[PDB]
Design a protein around this ligand. Sequence first.
Ligand SMILES: CC(C)(COP(=O)(O)OP(=O)(O)OC[C@H]1O[C@@H](n2cnc3c(N)ncnc32)[C@H](O)[C@@H]1OP(=O)(O)O)[C@@H](O)C(=O)NCCC(=O)NCCS
Length: 128
Amino acid sequence: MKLTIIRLEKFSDQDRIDLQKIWPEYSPSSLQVDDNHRIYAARFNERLLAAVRVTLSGTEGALDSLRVREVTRRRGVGQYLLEEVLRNNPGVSCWWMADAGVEDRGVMTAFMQALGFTTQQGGWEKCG
Ligand SMILES: CC(C)(COP(=O)(O)OP(=O)(O)OC[C@H]1O[C@@H](n2cnc3c(N)ncnc32)[C@H](O)[C@@H]1OP(=O)(O)O)[C@@H](O)C(=O)NCCC(=O)NCCS
């Protein structure tokens, strides 16, 4: 079982629907990425199991939003994905994770602490 993390360089209307299924509060924008704003899609067996948006502004890593499917509250997928990103993106020493006003942040921080992130003055930081 390997989580296939794909980079969303092109958005079909099929992807469009499933993305809105992951973010039911998000009105369908243009869905437009660049070499900095990089949206990665973790598809486990063809289907979206997790979605994360990382804005690599230069060599700085800004992690905004991350949603794994609700049922996947413990299946390695989340940490696997985060580690995978940090293992395939070298040089980026400053990983900054936004809180995004998430209320499941209690659970999120528990995930963060057990994975290897620290909370500093308004968000999670991982310099390394
Ligand atoms: C929270 C969430 C990431 C758990 O997803 P996941 O892919 O199962 O995460 P993992 O399986 O990698 O993490 C389980 C590990 O995280 C840590 N952890 C601690 N508390 C945890 C918790 N309450 N839930 C999940 N992981 C937790 C542990 O180290 C655990 O390791 P273990 O399985 O060996 O015990 C998933 O439910 C999710 O993404 N939901 C929220 C998406 C969302 O709405 N986010 C807002 C973006 S605005």
